[PDB]
Amino acid sequence: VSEDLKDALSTFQQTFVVSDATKPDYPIMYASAGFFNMTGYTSKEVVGRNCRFLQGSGTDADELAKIRETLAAGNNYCGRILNYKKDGTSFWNLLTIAPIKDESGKVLKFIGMQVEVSKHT
Amino acid sequence: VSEDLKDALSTFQQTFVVSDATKPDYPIMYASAGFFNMTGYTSKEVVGRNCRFLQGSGTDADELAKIRETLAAGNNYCGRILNYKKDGTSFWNLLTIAPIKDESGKVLKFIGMQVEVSKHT
Ligand SMILES: Cc1cc2nc3c(=O)[nH]c(=O)nc-3n(C[C@H](O)[C@H](O)[C@H](O)COP(=O)(O)O)c2cc1C
Ligand SMILES: Cc1cc2nc3c(=O)[nH]c(=O)nc-3n(C[C@H](O)[C@H](O)[C@H](O)COP(=O)(O)O)c2cc1C
């Protein structure tokens, strides 16, 4: 809440997840070290869930539409979206999603790199 | 993130490079084994080089402007760009660039994940 506090104890955390692209819920298969440090959810407990548990009231619906469109097309997504820690504390997520394709081009997984950043840049 | 990330991408035989954001022309520090297969260039040909050697006259200059802006801003970049293998073969490269930052929020590296993609030109 306090302005001076947030900046002095700036946490520029970074994590990634890998999700299964062959199931309609795009479930996390693996969440990297740092996921709990950033979000307050353990890397173990998020396995089998869709990453939308990080979203809340202020998350931009149009950005979510572009993500779904990316996953369906099998391409990539780059955005800065509003996410929420287990706490309910909001943070800005510099989110980069890329397809993990096999030898013949099949999209088997997606990787999502998540970077906590401030509101603008 | 970074070493764990490299390992996850390698586990799925992905093509990616890691570039130095502290050296001035973003030289490649690391090129995965998939890079040779995708481009015809070995890692040793390529380590120490800016990845612009993949470009040619068909490459969209407007996209390259978007990339320059991303790297100066420490943000991410998602696009599909026309690139050329060592033998001149032209292809779509779905390129995804994300920052790797330290404690400061200082960008140390960029990772660029590359996949050769068919055509919805
Ligand atoms: C690999 C991967 C990583 C993702 N990471 C996040 C994330 O960090 N924050 C978030 O809000 N959504 C993230 N998503 C997006 C959601 O999981 C979901 O795809 C999005 O909400 C759109 O689908 P929906 O409209 O059904 O919710 C990620 C998706 C994928 C597949
Ligand atoms: C990690 C990373 C990966 C990159 N991968 C590619 C690539 O696969 N193909 C390409 O044309 N450019 C790639 N680039 C972009 C070019 O290296 C260069 O940044 C771009 O051409 C803009 O700079 P310039 O206008 O000086 O050429 C990559 C850049 C970074 C930092």
Swiss-Prot record, chains A, B:
Upper classification of the organism: Eukaryota, Viridiplantae, Streptophyta, Embryophyta, Tracheophyta
Post-translational modification: 2 molecules of FMN bind covalently to cysteines after exposure to blue light and are reversed in the dark.
Start and end residues of each PAS domain: 1-74
Family: Belongs to the protein kinase superfamily. AGC Ser/Thr protein kinase family.
List of residues that carry Phosphoserine: 2
Domain PAC, first and last residues per copy: 75-121
Tissue-by-tissue expression: Present in guard cells (at protein level).
Compartment annotation: Cell membrane; Cytoplasm
Residue numbers of S-4a-FMN cysteine PTMs: 51
Chain positions recorded as FMN 1 binding sites: 50, 52, 55, 68, 83, 93, 114, 119
Coiled-coil annotated residue ranges, if any: none
Function according to Swiss-Prot or TrEMBL: Protein kinase that acts as a blue light (BL) photoreceptor in a signal-transduction pathway for photo-induced movements. Triggers the phosphorylation of AHA1 and AHA2 C-terminal penultimate Thr in guard cells to activate them and induce stomatal opening in response to blue light (BL). Also phosphorylates BLUS1, a kinase involved in stomatal opening. Mediates the phosphorylation of CBC1 in stomata, but not of CBC2, in response to blue light. Required for blue light mediated mRNA destabilization. Mediates calcium spiking of extracellular origin in response to a low rate of blue light.
The name this protein goes by in its record: Phototropin-1
Subunit details: Homodimer; disulfide-linked. Interacts with PKS1, PKS2, RPT2, RPT3, PHOT2 and BLUS1. Subunit of a complex made of CAR6, PHOT1 and RPT3/NPH3. Associates with CBC1 and CBC2. Binds to BHP.
Further facts: Undergoes a photocycle characterized by fluorescence and absorption changes induced by blue light. Half-time of photoproduct formation is 14 seconds and 70 seconds for dark regeneration.
Coverage span on the entire protein: 184 to 304 of 996
KO phenotype (gene knockout): Enhanced drought tolerance, when associated with PHOT2 disruption. Plants lacking both PHOT1 and PHOT2 have curled downward leaves missing color changes and lower petiole angles in response to weak or strong blue light (BL). Impaired proton H(+) pumping associated with altered increased ATP hydrolysis and absence of binding between 14-3-3 protein and H(+)-ATPase (e.g. AHA1 and AHA2) in response to BL in guard cells of plants missing PHOT1 and PHOT2.
This protein's encoding gene: PHOT1
Free-text comment about domains: The activation loop within the kinase domain is the target of phosphorylation. The PAS (PER-ARNT-SIM) domains are required for the binding of FMN chromophores.
Top-rank taxon: Eukaryota
